[PDB]
């Protein structure tokens, strides 16, 4: 059974261009507009002084 909503309306991996992110979005804390998907998070360097909040 679908139990949780998981899709983010409006909001696009900038890693992979998923759209919409589906599961967990990690969103830039220090950039103004910038999410990665979970695989992105786990998978691609951004900014190592950056860090990364967790919107499930
Ligand atoms: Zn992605
Ligand atoms: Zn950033």
Known sequence: ?????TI?????C????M?????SRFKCRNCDDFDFCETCFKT?????????GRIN
């Open 1 to 5: 059974a679908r139990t949780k909503q």
């Open 8 to 12: 983010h309306p409006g909001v696009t």
């Open 14 to 17: 900038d890693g992979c261009q």
């Open 19 to 23: 759209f919409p992110i589906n599961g």
């Open 44 to 52: 691609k360097k951004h900014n190592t002084r950056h860090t990364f």
